[PDB]
Design a protein around this ligand. Structure first.
Ligand SMILES: CCC(CC)[C@H](NC(C)=O)[C@@H]1[C@H](O)[C@@H](C(=O)O)C[C@H]1NC(=N)N
Ligand SMILES: CCC(CC)[C@H](NC(C)=O)[C@@H]1[C@H](O)[C@@H](C(=O)O)C[C@H]1NC(=N)N
Ligand SMILES: CCC(CC)[C@H](NC(C)=O)[C@@H]1[C@H](O)[C@@H](C(=O)O)C[C@H]1NC(=N)N
Ligand SMILES: CCC(CC)[C@H](NC(C)=O)[C@@H]1[C@H](O)[C@@H](C(=O)O)C[C@H]1NC(=N)N
Lengths: 387, 387, 387, 387
């Protein structure tokens, strides 16, 4: 029976730790896939941690240039949330250097993008077997979320990008049912840039917080209705949640356009709470270190900078990285609303550290009705490795 | 359907071995999590061994200061009772440096405590997803049992401590149903000290034998009714079952107050048998070595020192450590009463041995109608390791 | 309930990647069985990757003469498609240095051939237990497909060869139901040579594309009806799809006889598409390197050389090897026709490279309605190994 | 529902290979438990390989004196038949240096014997939890089968020995239902010696072929009826099937008394076939090397030495060892009779080879209606190891 994700996202006051895999630390002696871009998605029975392997393991010579983002050895795999991305407990999902996945109440759907940069192919899987495909439509690194996709009443949706990673690119919403594509839409966002959207279900619609690697330090936002009509813009909040970025005091929000000159960026997330917003970000404003989430009153609908809550999950003396959102299935939380949860990726190795490799572990946090105390659940690995 | 643990604890004459994981010995070459504080808990289908990892493996550099008790890398995981705490067979439970867990007949509930010492957070899980939380209420290492919690007719109970580990601290009983907290009580025990309670179901109530790390060498006791009313005191028996402690001859029992001057201590257990009591303890009275369990006639209700039975499980030439209780589900034992079972933790490494690490394995014993012969099922590992 | 594989094979325009195990690369540090001859077969619930181990692991001395094709240590095992052939996730199937396997809708059937070269024995398994046997009938390396067998409405069929690997040999079709042999037929093919047939279901009959290691560079073909009547010949197409072979321009097809002088060969596959054919082959015409599949119009019924589609899966700068076919169960693809899928084996080590061992990994591709772009999903391992 | 093992044992003409684990060869680099005494037993759904670990792994220092037969680190574990006794796929069964196990149609029952030599304890398990116990009754190494026990219509039976391993000892039959002992009988066999019985179901009764380590070179036999009445004697056959032993020509059989002077011995098996018998034995008559099984006409009821069939499974240039019997459940073989199957243990290391350790792998064979060709599926490991 299809999973009903039609409920509203629960209003949360704080965040509690769900899991921590300790992938790298274990990888010093255990058999762990060198990885990157991990994310969480849950079925009505369990939550899994998806990740992009590099076809090699930690502390092995094949972990050499594992910073190259894309290769034909890159594969999407999964384990139960909390377990390291070890070989022996892993489930194979798809061949990919970019991916997304989600359960529709009956089975798992995954989308792995691989192939050559100018004509990549996204293979859609459902039930452990390819079922449909999307070919590059702009011919320039067809890619996707790097976080959980969203399924509402049997239908699943996700966003893909194809084109430059700086100047204007192209963006689409895809809709599928049982692994078969049944709809797509072109997102008009002239001047705006969308990458690695972090999405979740809310009041029957798909809400995402993405990344603008062109000119904005504030994150793009889009609300997707099942029919495929949408709303694109930026997190109104007058606090920039991307990295790199500038000071908050010198920032001016906008729900319509990108602000700041900073070009690059990093995947991030955000949850709407009525008119408010829970927004995650690295503590360092120039680097991928530390991690905190702030709740801004009216932050979702106005250029507000009023902070009602702040919780640290990784201090600034430790490397962070990607971070995305997902929700707990009602069939597991017992609650009457979708529990918002996010994960934070913690990168170790190049380009910041003295190693031939690059990989990451993660920490997962979830909704909760109380305010939780600050702390640092960092990676903890001691670099460099025996190599 | 909920597990009925309303029956009385079976009267046992001796104890038979259930399992032995050989974690450390295997860990010399296999991929085993460095651990500490292991315990057993059973569902209607199987018994599992829960443990606190240190986010690292044996014979790896990350096992360095693994004696520090608390860190943000510490996680609660589980395996089927008897298997070593190896990476590839482990299930992730919670992020924690202190924990408890138990099955209610439908699912597993676990409680992991992590965070900073002054404002720690206990995340409650049910079904593999966080469901509720308890924040530090005394702001000084919020902690729990380190042994199986207790579920009776759908409701599960457990004890937590928050405050100093020497002088007076504070103690509470928590009650939950389906992962949602629905009750709590403050335990008044002025002059007494409660830590790491070992609990089990008996005649419809929760009975625990705990640890007084303040001034007592005899163990605190509390009988918890489902409504949350309780009874707190000490094991009446005139034989001190804590470590360190003094001679038995020079000991005077008390069901009301702590006796002896010895400050420190070690987690231990005890089972009521009508008016009698099966009490476990290290053979050495000053160190954590050896292990034996004694049955004292009328030992539960009087300052009795009459020994009717004595069985050794670990001789005094071998290191022991923690030990807790749990019961076999009627749906597995086929019996008509709850079969009492305990486990003994065997510590290797610091602070007693020449290693950079600290970890432990275990041996599990269970009820049984006959007297079992003495022996030593010790750890067996050859220290030091390649390091 | 029996799996209905009575439908026609879907008409495909291109092929999308299903999986890539990265077995060798992982094997540099992980615990991977040295293997050879891998293949895919699917049940109504999942697809598995079967393989022939050599009773040893990569980067271990026992991988020494692992090029010898046959030994008493060789065993057939399986894992879910996409996982490396690692120890801890493997299911034991049969003792064998030659094999075939397939699911009939209720259980898995496997056929492992082992024993001495002059009187080998094929043990048939069904449900994880031997059920029947076939003894060598020609007394000269009794062998089979090295690819998925075919089950139609409860009955499974496969082809075996017994006799010389150069000059004329003998060939048979075997039929079984629930692991019990219930039929066999002798294939008269005087002048022709059949080895390692790659088969699949089509319009209610078993269609195979095999290997002629005697004198032909074009592949033998046989259409098997459930009653055991058959049709034997060669892929009509005027393009030689075996290796080694000569130029295409200098080739003349034939649906009746072997063409070319080239003796040796390599396992390959082919799918009928109405009158057309999708045929796989190594790019190099002299060596086992690179891999591409071509669609020849009318290629199945005429000596046609008209290429309508060409897709590369492994470039010529990388080693390839065996390749076979299998189909997706309707109960997984949701489609109304059998989705054609193939796999390509990529050999590393002897006799082409500087290693004491020989093994291989694989890449799996599947049907799909669109044309997919060229690329190379090669092995990726860095030889030689620590040895 | 209880497994019906009331049928007669199928008449077999030859034996086909079921599995081969390659435990030692894999153990050169993989994580394999050093073991000894392996055996096979099947449930209505699968066959498993039980084994006695030594609490340590191959190629690790803890494998040092692993020849000592008994220690408190010895544990009984299992895996699916065919898989090596690796850490990550193993199920914990019991603490033991001697064991037996079998499925009754509903669950697994195992019996592990551990403790001190003078007062050992046999813990009986059913469903993964201890359920009953047997204490040493002679106080001298209480021990059991080292092979599969036998369950007929819900009841399981097995044989235990307690006393000297040379001169007269004591022997009993145990009967249990759902893990609870409900019967036992003393076997009067004055002058005879019974050890490690290999048993199987036949025409509703339990038939075993055991080992006389006192004075006989021929094997003891006992037919056990469910009511516990029995028949004890020796394999009538005039061919000695124990090791060491003397020439066959100089042997005189007896169904009543032990023959030959040879003292020691080795576990072996035998299947009745009407009046005939399939008997296994090492090829060497003085050492534990090679393995063959012979069918002797009328061999079960007369001092017959008429050989109708002979099949080799391990040549004399390779080490063998223990060997026991088990039967395939009708619910798996689809047949109408119990399929007889045996396993052969192959010892490597001390006392015959230059290693600090001792362990073994195995090969499993099964019934079958045809005669199978001779061959050698030996261990294949290259000793010594890195140590
Ligand atoms: C070129 C476009 C980039 C996205 C903004 C790039 N995406 C892909 C598919 O390569 C990401 C980016 O280079 C890396 C990062 O910013 O950390 C990860 C990297 N993502 C992945 N390797 N999956
Ligand atoms: C500071 C309070 C102590 C309890 C009496 C302390 N508990 C915690 C949560 O740190 C324990 C104690 O220091 C150690 C021991 O006595 O062996 C284990 C240690 N327990 C854990 N690391 N889980
Ligand atoms: C001698 C006949 C050959 C088939 C044409 C030979 N088959 C067997 C059972 O040994 C194959 C051949 O030598 C190897 C190859 O061509 O790659 C694989 C090899 N196949 C296997 N080892 N399973
Ligand atoms: C002392 C009695 C012996 C049986 C005849 C002895 N049994 C036990 C429980 O120790 C066996 C014997 O010494 C060894 C062998 O013959 O190979 C195995 C050994 N068996 C086991 N270690 N389980």
């Amino acid at each position: 029976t299809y999973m009903n994700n039609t409920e509203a996202i629960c209003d949360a006051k704080g965040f509690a730790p769900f899991s921590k895999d300790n992938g790298i630390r274990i990888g010093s002696r255990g058999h762990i896939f060198v990885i990157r871009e991990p994310f969480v998605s849950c079925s009505p029975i369990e939550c899994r941690t998806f990740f992009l392997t590099q076809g090699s393991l930690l502390n092995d010579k094949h972990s050499n240039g594992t910073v190259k983002d894309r290769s034909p050895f890159r594969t999407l795999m999964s384990v139960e949330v909390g377990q390291s991305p070890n070989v022996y407990q892993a489930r194979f999902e798809a061949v990919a250097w970019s991916a997304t996945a989600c359960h529709d109440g009956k089975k798992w759907m995954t989308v792995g993008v691989t192939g050559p940069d100018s004509k990549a192919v996204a293979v859609i899987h459902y039930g452990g077997v390819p079922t449909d495909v999307v070919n590059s439509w702009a011919g320039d690194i067809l890619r996707t979320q790097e976080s959980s996709c969203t399924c509402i009443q049997g239908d699943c949706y996700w966003v893909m990008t194809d084109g430059p990673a700086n100047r204007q690119a192209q963006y689409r919403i895809y809709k599928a049912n049982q692994g078969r594509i049944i709809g797509q839409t072109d997102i008009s966002f002239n001047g705006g840039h969308i990458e690695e959207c972090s999405c979740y279900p809310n009041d029957g619609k798909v809400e995402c917080v993405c990344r603008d690697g062109w000119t904005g330090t504030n994150r793009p936002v889009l609300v997707i209705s099942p029919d495929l009509s949408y709303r694109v813009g930026y997190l109104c909040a007058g606090i920039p949640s991307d990295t790199p970025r500038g000071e908050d005091t010198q920032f001016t929000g906008s729900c319509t356009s990108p602000m700041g000159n900073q070009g690059y960026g990093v995947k991030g997330f955000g949850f709407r709470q009525g008119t408010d917003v829970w927004m995650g970000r690295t503590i360092s404003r120039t680097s991928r270190s530390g991690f905190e989430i702030l709740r801004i009153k009216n932050g979702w609908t106005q250029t507000s900078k009023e902070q009602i809550r702040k919780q640290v999950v990784v201090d600034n003396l430790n490397w962070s990285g990607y971070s995305g959102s997902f929700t707990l299935p009602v069939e597991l939380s017992g609650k009457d609303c979708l529990v918002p949860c996010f994960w934070v990726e913690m990168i170790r190795g190049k380009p910041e550290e003295k190693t031939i490799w690059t990989s990451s572990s993660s920490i997962v946090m979830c909704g909760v009705d109380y305010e939780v105390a600050d702390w640092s659940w960092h990676d903890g690995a001691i670099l460099p490795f025996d190599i």
